[PDB]
A paper describes a structure:
To ascertain if a differential preference for G-based nucleotides in the allosteric site exists, two further structures were determined, one with dGTP included in the crystallisation of an active site mutant SAMHD1(115–583, R164A) and the other with GTP and the nucleotide analogue inhibitor 2′,3′-didehydro-2′,3′-dideoxythymidine (d4T) included in the crystallisation of a SAMHD1(115–626) construct. The SAMHD1(115–583, R164A) structure has the same asymmetric conformation observed in the SAMHD1(115–583)-ddGTP structure and has dGTP bound at the AL1 allosteric site. Nucleotides are absent from the active site likely as a result of the introduction of the R164A substrate binding mutation. The electron density that nucleotides were built into is presented in S6 Fig. The G base in all three structures makes the same hydrogen bonds with D137, Q142 and R145 of one monomer along with a stacking interaction with R451' of the opposing monomer. The basic side chains of K116 and R451' also make equivalent electrostatic interactions with the triphosphate of the bound nucleotide illustrating that the binding mode for each of the guanine nucleotides is broadly conserved.
Residue numbers in the entry:
A (entry chain D), D (entry chain B): 115 to 276, 285 to 505, 547 to 582
B (entry chain C): 115 to 276, 284 to 483, 490 to 507, 514 to 530, 539 to 542, 547 to 582
C (entry chain A): 115 to 276, 284 to 505, 515 to 530, 547 to 582
Write the structure that this text describes.
């Protein structure tokens, strides 16, 4: 029973089966992926990686089921169920790529627009690659798990159904609300990284997650079983929501932070043709096509940033120069922000077209210089949706032009006007 | 005038000249060097890098000199003096290598026992390379610094004198040299930051309040010298600082697994030294062990070198790579025992390479290649701290808390370990070391 | 099991027996007695009363005894021992009168030099009156107390003994008498709370972390006896506590105007003592100064007696009312000087009344332009590391003034000058230090 | 220039003119009026009075106006303006009666439903009484004020117009926004008592009023000059609002605290008839009619609670027993809560009727007991409006009855159903 010190949760005790999963290359992989990606280039305290976060969510996942299990013995929550929820909590973010959400959120859409990719999909794949590669299934049975049934359960908690769930019966419906909760969005994943991002960012956390946990109970709501709170900690709920809004307003939506993630992304796009990651059977993969083979994906982390930066290969100069602009702090320039009214949602696959769309708008009054689409970055921020535009040219005569193309682009697409 | 948010110090304000120094390849480099080295492999929260620590030290150096200047205008502390103290604070750890203290503490001594090397030396070398490569001296003058002897001052604040031995400032401003790196108490803003910072990442309660000390600190005469002295009501705070220091060392820095992993990473670098090429100045190519000789190569040497080995396909690198994979699967070297050299003078860096052979020479037989000998130092003080009362303000005025030598074995079977245990016990006896309990 | 939110201690949980004691006239009385008395007329944040102080002392006493018991079961601390220690913390300041230390420190001495009175005594009389008035003893037994023995124990924790002088507990449990009121070192939970609390209302930084001290406290043997001892790393915390204590005393408790105002209020009470009637037990009627003789009357004696005077229409009370109106217009007595009785026998409470005659009777000559009677003087008498055992956790079970101020009622320049001379001369005649 | 130590604002420097105003019976009165009234009987840390709050507001009022003038000298802000803004902050709550809002919010409505009264009216009446009784007008001129013009100015800041303002021209309209601002309800009164109540109640305060003051600007908005904050301060505003909601939910709307405030009020109503307060010319007044003469009102503070509690007169027995109930903690019992629907308000003039309305409701399924109007307490809590009903009879057969009468009163009056 390894016990781990954590700056947020204090002591974390880990059941030997978890320890067994943790000590594999496919997991240790997470020590090398910053939680806030390029946020670190705005918040120096944000040095933390997915690894310690994943331990925390797995740890809280355990705490929540055992607390429910003790206060409501009728729910018939077993030894087996607890371990499976911890494992879902531990591996929920296994599928992350370099710089977290930058990777599945922007890069893969821009690099391979055909492809439907989510990091959850990856997490289920990585988890399979892990237990197969490290003979975890024998260990699973030693501690009372049924590989055929429980592995399905674990995967379902992560990605959803592949009554649509075959991993557990409908009477244990409340469990699927524990690691990842789609429709109210209150799950142990958020509790952990709210507290953790706050701790590293120096932002105040008003939410007390453990009082939330032992006032937590299972109740019947519309004849399907969900996790509910007793109502005088409604005061606690609003504190969580305020903590959420602050992290978004102060950190996740930060204007420089997001620019930098789009610069790291631009660098990656310029290096994809040239960088090789070795996957299974010696085959070589691109940064963008490593999602196709997990042996390669295991080797794809935040390190790819430095591999570009330190490279001498002349083929990599254009990428290397973009990363060097970040080091010297000559960043892309902020042009403006807009929103999609009314119900139009920009879809990931239309990301690649947008810089052409803006550049092709006819802004007249026309002025001295005309900008190609290569001069524009269009950034799509989702929770609402924000659309921000940055210009790569820093002439103030180009920057003026970029603003005109933009104000009219919003117009031609019926977006809010850039206040 | 940029302002940075810090989880430890809150908002940090930076002079434009500082931002200029910060926004260079030679400084941002520190974003890619872990502060606690292999500690990250025992304390998952210890994810922090040399970068945020250097900002903190720069900030604190600023806070203290500004505090002194405003309450004692007679000391003649200039705006020029403050900037030089901040810049010294900012760049003091520029010279660190992959995994900080691991690099100059164990790797360089084991790879090149020949060599003169401390990271403080490097910081100076790197500091020179930085201001030269990025045209800083014009910007220094632009803000009123005199490059030729202010740069000397900064370097002297970092590494010490290159009598009154300092050329950077006259003896009447001697107390400034106590701010960033103070060796005769070891009480300086560098320690303050990383006590506060390591605790925050490790979950150890820090009982020293550095902000209170800075608010009561004054310059007073002591033995014909000007020193920074503390108000006498801050003595309780000093005892807390020494216990926090003591907790950090017992609980984290001297962690047994933590150090084993430090020696495993080190063993891997050595097996990779012959084969890894780092591109330096003039296109010359360098090794991990020789990158310290040219700063243009050294800028490209960070923690990344770990993952370059870990991910490599080159068969030359299998030996180094297999050790790192061993760290990943958590098959670490096994702990055999601990001893101290007390009574006699302590082990020096230049004989580190010899220690495994010495152990092998004291059922199954083990050669030196399977032994790891690890030497843990605290520094390779309350009576050196001056107080002042408030009645005559420019006057100086049981219950408190080394070298450790540990040996690890690479063979993990139950009888190699037993033999290994006895090779150790006999090596301890033979060299007059304490007997392993 | 009631839980109360507190700005210093967070949530305070209260055992039902305590709640029964709290919810009585004799206890709720403490809501109407300011802790710092006239200090409030100098520190506007200091609005707090003895009631919240008492909850905290009760809460801390509990924390400490609970903490010790769980870490050293060999001490054999019962649930019953904990309740009695808590009840003692709760009722230790039950005996305070109007404006706290003002009442027993200056008013009763000036009014009845005759009489021996301390509020600790009163806390005991009031405590008896409480549990008898509200039928607490049946409730005590319901929760496992033995009233005759445990009430003696609680009383002894408050006022001290009424060889091993305590009847309430055996010497193997001696360390319990150190928690609420600690005789010779003055380190008790009473001080811990009011240091924290006074700091909090006054805006003075408190550097003592009482939560750390309680978490490392152990009972260890010292000189044949069991005493409460601290870990060796908490010596740093102790020095902070002693400084926080000295800062509170020098900045607030000894504040010059604050004290001048306490003596103005006292003067007013003295001028109103003859004419105010407090209805005691059995319709018997009492004065402010004699209400201490009956607890039923004393329950009705709080800070309110100030506004009763101030708001009065009665002409017998005009003399008193005017002094209190002076406080409102801030025409206060003027500070003339301060002195100390260094190496001299110190002034006793029985001699307080005489002192202003003594000062007016000094002949300061150089003779001055005006002569001042004794009624024109106020003379104020203000009274204020070895003691602590430490332990090594390798070896866990064994150890390792008076101020005299004078104020003049005539303001101031010719009165104030004259006053300084009478005073400097009084110091000489009395061998007190020369006024700075 | 007296300097005062304060737990919230630290050191407060006070101009001699202000010191001249404070040192009067009519101001010092506020030392005897609890800020959270009956709240103290639930939150023991809440021992603080109207006096320290008023100093605080006066201090903040000064800091804000001094700030605007030095960052925007075109605004023409004189020292004379600063002193008038300080005096308005200081005397804005001069008009409070026993237990603050309890007096004008509930007691005076129940005792004299016919009548005008608000404490803001009282503050102006008391301020006038203050300066006349203490020869304040000469000191005003000595430090440069024009009494006829400036006394009007101060009064308007407190109570509003008696362009509607006679005290200052519209080009200085922004000054009327500082002490009491009802357009947005964001004024320095609120900053103080938010911070102060947080400090005494032990509720965490997220608003930094200091950062707000040095980003505050005077700017033109829609024809008029109003006070605005930097766009980087929008996060701080949300913090102020969370701090506010936390206080309302956790303290000001506390169920027992509000119950006790109505018990005290009942105690006053039962004592009104027999207690005499001596006003000007020896004329005698009631607690409810002391608001008519400022000499009597000055001597009307929280002391009236203890005057009843300690009384022997048999006329006062019934009142005294209600207070003794508070001492023993035998309180009214909580029956239920409801809201009005429509944008309809219950008005102060109608408070007196509500207990009769509840008792006359025909609730049934008939009951074991019949309840009189005297057995009901109807409490109206304003921010929305909450309506609570308490019963003075504590047996469960009455308490059951009371609940039926209440739910039925809600029905025929179309309030929401009490859950
Ligand atoms: N220059 C620089 N700023 C950093 C760094 N690390 C964290 N920060 C902080 C400081 C800034 O508040 C924020 C980014 O500021 P920027 O310099 O990128 O843009 P900003 O608009 O604040 O300044 P500007 O007017 O464009 O020169 O992140 C760093 O390594 N270098
Ligand atoms: N296996 C593993 N341990 C970790 C990790 N991170 C932090 N730790 C902590 C947990 C323990 O407190 C400490 C010891 O881990 P070890 O694998 O070295 O276990 P240890 O040698 O103490 O016991 P064992 O060899 O299993 O009997 O390091 C991690 O990522 N993987
Ligand atoms: N005047 C006055 N001062 C107060 C009040 N409340 C708290 N304080 C503070 C301000 C001062 O720091 C101290 C009282 O000073 P005083 O005005 O009573 O006498 P002080 O000797 O400071 O000045 P003075 O003799 O008039 O020159 O307590 C108050 O209500 N009125
Ligand atoms: N009995 C009592 N409670 C107090 C006192 N002071 C503060 N409190 C706290 C305890 C509670 O959290 C809150 C109100 O408690 P109450 O006993 O008066 O009503 P509640 O319905 O919450 O409790 P109950 O149903 O009677 O057990 O105020 C006090 O002086 N006496
Ligand atoms: Fe996650
Ligand atoms: Fe350092
Ligand atoms: Fe006490
Ligand atoms: Fe107010």
């Amino acid at each position: 029973m390894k016990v781990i010190n954590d700056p947020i949760h204090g002591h974390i005790e880990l059941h030997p089966l978890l320890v067994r999963i943790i000590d594999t290359p496919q997991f240790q992989r997470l020590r090398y992926i910053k939680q806030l990606g390029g946020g670190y280039y705005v918040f120096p305290g944000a040095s933390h990686n997915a690894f310690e976060h994943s331990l925390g969510v797995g740890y809280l996942a355990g705490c929540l089921v055992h607390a429910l299990g003790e206060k409501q013995p009728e729910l018939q929550i077993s030894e087996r169920d607890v371990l499976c929820v911890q494992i879902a909590g531990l591996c929920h973010d296994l599928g992350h790529g370099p710089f977290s959400h930058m990777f599945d959120g922007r890069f893969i859409p821009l690099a391979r627009p055909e492809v439907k990719w989510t990091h959850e999909q990856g997490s289920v794949m990585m988890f399979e690659h892990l237990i197969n590669s490290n003979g975890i299934k024998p260990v699973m049975e030693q501690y009372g798990l049924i590989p055929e049934e429980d592995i399905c359960f674990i995967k379902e908690q992560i990605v959803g159904p592949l009554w649509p769930y075959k991993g557990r019966p409908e009477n244990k419906s409340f469990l699927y609300e524990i690691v990842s909760n789609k429709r109210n969005g209150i799950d142990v994943d958020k509790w952990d990284y709210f507290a953790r991002d706050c701790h590293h960012l120096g932002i105040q956390n008003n939410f007390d997650y453990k009082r939330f946990i032992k006032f937590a109970r299972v109740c019947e709501v519309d004849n399907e079983l969900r996790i509910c709170a007793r109502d005088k900690e409604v005061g606690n709920l609003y504190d969580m929501f305020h903590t959420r809004n602050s992290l978004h307003r102060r950190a996740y939506q930060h204007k420089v932070g997001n620019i930098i993630d789009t610069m790291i992304t631009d660098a990656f796009l310029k290096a994809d043709d040239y960088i090789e990651i070795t996957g299974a059977g010696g085959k070589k993969y691109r940064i963008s096509t490593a999602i196709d083979d997990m042996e390669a994906y295991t080797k794809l982390t935040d390190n790819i940033f430095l591999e570009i930066l330190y490279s001498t290969d002349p083929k990599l100069k254009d990428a290397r120069e973009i990363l060097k602009q970040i080091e010297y702090r000559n960043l892309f320039k902020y042009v403006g922000e807009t929103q999609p009214t009314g119900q139009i949602k920009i879809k990931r696959e239309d990301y690649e077209s947008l810089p052409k769309e803006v550049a092709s708008a006819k802004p007249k009054v026309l002025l001295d210089v005309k900008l190609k689409a290569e001069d524009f970055i269009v950034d799509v921020i989702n929770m609402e949706q924000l659309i921000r535009v940055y210009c790569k040219k820093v002439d103030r005569k180009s920057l003026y032009a970029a603003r005109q193309y933009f104000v009219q682009w919003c117009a031609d697409r019926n977006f809010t006007k850039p206040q």
